[PDB]
């Protein structure tokens, strides 16, 4: 398309890549990212509707405690690029085809961002080596280099989708067999155990293991919701603290 439009799209994707990890101005969130990509490429309604229908999915997609997020940034950017590439915005092609492609590319962005943040350890090590010499310039520069690499992680894998055409990506994603799809599904249905594993490992004592087993035993009561179990944990902690501090006073 227009050269200015292409430059705008690439810069906007770079900002979205930056804020998929910065997560401060919410530049990467679909509601603004898809709408703003639509702003660059003419038609406003396509981007607005894609962002609106993707923000519903993107709720609660915040990475917490190193539990990496589904990376809505690349999902939004790539879905918007595919939508503008294919001249169809009947609000049915948007939901039927573009949204599942966005989810799959969100998983792809998940693996991409995990790879790049694993690579970030090298640059942070170089930053430590530079800060050994005690220069603000070196550490600031290495931090900026890591940030710009993370931004390029979406800047570069956007022109590829914008360039090749519009039908190879959708067909390629649709050609994935049930083999790997269901395998990854059952893998993700148990991956959270590892995430909780380090949390349990860090805080653990013979005094605290009983509470873990107590929670595990009491959990199957479906009548108590998660917030109910949280309040129950809080009150159990309060009671134990009161009973211990009663002897602490004496």
């Amino acid at each position: 398309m227009s050269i200015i439009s292409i430059i705008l799209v690439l810069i906007f994707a770079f900002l979205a890549g930056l804020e998929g990890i910065l997560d401060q101005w919410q530049f990467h969130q679909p509601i603004i990212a898809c709408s703003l990509i639509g702003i660059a490429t003419g038609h406003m309604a396509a981007g607005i509707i894609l962002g609106g229908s993707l923000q519903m999915i993107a709720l609660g997609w915040a990475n917490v405690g190193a539990a990496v997020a589904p990376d809505a940034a690349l999902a939004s950017v790539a879905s918007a690029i595919l939508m503008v590439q294919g001249g169809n915005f009947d609000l049915t092609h948007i939901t039927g085809v573009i949204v599942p492609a966005a989810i799959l590319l969100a998983t792809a962005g998940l693996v991409l961002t995990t790879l790049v943040r694993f690579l970030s350890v090298g640059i942070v090590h170089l930053a430590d080596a530079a800060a050994e010499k005690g220069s603000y310039s070196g550490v600031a520069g290495w931090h900026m280099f890591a940030l710009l690499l993370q931004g390029l992680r979406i800047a570069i894998p956007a022109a590829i989708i914008l360039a090749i055409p519009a039908e190879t990506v959708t067909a390629a994603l649709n050609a994935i067999p049930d083999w790997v799809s269901k395998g990854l599904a059952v893998g993700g249905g148990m991956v959270v155990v590892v995430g909780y594993a380090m949390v349990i490992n860090l805080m653990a004592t013979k005094e605290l293991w009983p509470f873990f087993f107590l929670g595990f035993v009491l959990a199957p009561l479906s009548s108590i919701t998660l917030i109910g179990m949280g309040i129950l944990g809080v009150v159990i902690a309060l009671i134990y603290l009161n009973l211990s501090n009663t002897a602490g006073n004496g």
């Binding site: 603004i32 148990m190 590892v194 199957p220």
Partner: protein, 360 residues
């Protein structure tokens, strides 16, 4: 005294703490964002190349992970600490490190639900409901509301962490933390157990892993009695078993009368059937069918006990506990570095194998 950083310097510190993330590592999480945020104050405090500088910069190269929004209080507190050290106030590095670690955890735990899971869902829902109409109002609304809330929180909490400074260190050292940490650990362990039980679905149904189905019984499952051609019969009072090896069962029509009065099973007048076969099912037959199903009585003629059913009858979430303990042992037995990523890929491969084998 001197080295009193002005309001402009604090605003620059906040505009740089804008970038707390970005140097996100797996081994030293979010560590460089702190240094980037405090660079202006440190630069105003010491010149580059100074040994005291050297030590100050090297101090902040440790683990620091929390919610980025609730870090301005911590930033202000450590800024106050740094300006205390600059003037020569006797406070060791251990004090600052303990101050940081004190609310690195609990503040993250309280900020994660209040921002990622409380404010953002509401703002995103309103933005999406506005955007469903194809109007440019929604993205600007989301942007303005979220950035205003975030900027107000950042600035005001940063200032509240600047003022009331060493007082918060006294509060930390007053023994309260020895209670906050214990309470948080107890609550976290309890909730972790609950989540291990609940948020780990290792459903083992599959097309394989199905234990052999047994013929069950002659009434433990839904269905009625079919006598020769048509009609539905109910078992009556037992009158005794004959010597040949068959017991005559009283037969009653679905009206309260008595007909037939014979034996049950193939050779008898009526035999047991499920709901699949009989047609013209009448209202009384429905009444008894829902009476049976509402009682918890079995449904399939051949009940199938999956491996998941056996595991649940043992204890729900058995496999989840076993996997948790296995990964705990793997993390305890030092299998070099990068162990979590290897565990993740191995478990994904294991899931693929389980699905293709027909187990899960």
């Amino acid at each position: 005294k001197k080295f009193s950083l002005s309001k402009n310097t604090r605003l620059s510190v906040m505009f740089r703490s804008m970038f707390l993330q970005g140097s996100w590592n797996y081994e030293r999480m979010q560590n460089l964002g702190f240094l980037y945020s405090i660079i202006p104050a440190l630069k105003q405090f010491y010149k580059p190349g100074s040994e005291e500088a050297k030590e100050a910069l090297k101090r902040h190269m440790e683990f620091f992970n929390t919610h980025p929004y609730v870090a301005a209080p911590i930033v202000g507190v450590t800024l106050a600490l740094e300006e205390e050290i600059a003037n020569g106030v006797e406070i060791d590095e251990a004090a600052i490190q303990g101050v940081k670690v004190g609310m690195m955890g609990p503040l993250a735990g309280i900020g994660d639900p209040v921002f990622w899971f409380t404010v953002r869902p509401i703002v995103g829902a309103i933005a999406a409901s506005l955007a469903t109409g194809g109007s440019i109002i929604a993205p600007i609304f989301f942007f303005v509301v979220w950035n205003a809330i975030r900027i107000a929180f950042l600035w005001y909490t940063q200032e509240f962490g600047y003022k009331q400074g060493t007082a918060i260190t006294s509060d930390l050292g007053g023994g309260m933390l020895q209670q906050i940490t214990k309470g948080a650990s107890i609550l976290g362990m309890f909730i972790l157990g609950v989540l291990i039980q609940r948020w780990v679905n290792i459903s083992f149904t599959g097309p394989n892993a199905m234990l052999p189905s047994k013929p069950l019984a002659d009434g433990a499952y839904v269905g009625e009695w079919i006598d020769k051609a048509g009609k539905v019969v109910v078992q009556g009072a037992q009158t005794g078993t004959t010597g040949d090896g068959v017991a005559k069962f009283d037969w009653l029509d679905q009206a309260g009368n008595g007909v037939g009065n014979g034996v049950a099973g193939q050779g008898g007048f009526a035999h047991y059937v499920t709901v699949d076969q009989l047609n013209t099912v009448d209202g009384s037959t429905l009444h008894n069918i829902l009476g049976q199903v509402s009682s918890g009585l079995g449904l399939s003629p051949e009940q199938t006990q999956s491996l998941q059913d056996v595991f649940n009858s043992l204890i729900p979430g058995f496999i989840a506990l076993l996997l948790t303990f296995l990964v705990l042992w793997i993390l305890r037995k030092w299998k070099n570095k990068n162990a979590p990523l290897f565990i993740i890929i191995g478990m994904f491969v294991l899931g693929i194998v389980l699905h293709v084998a027909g187990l899960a």
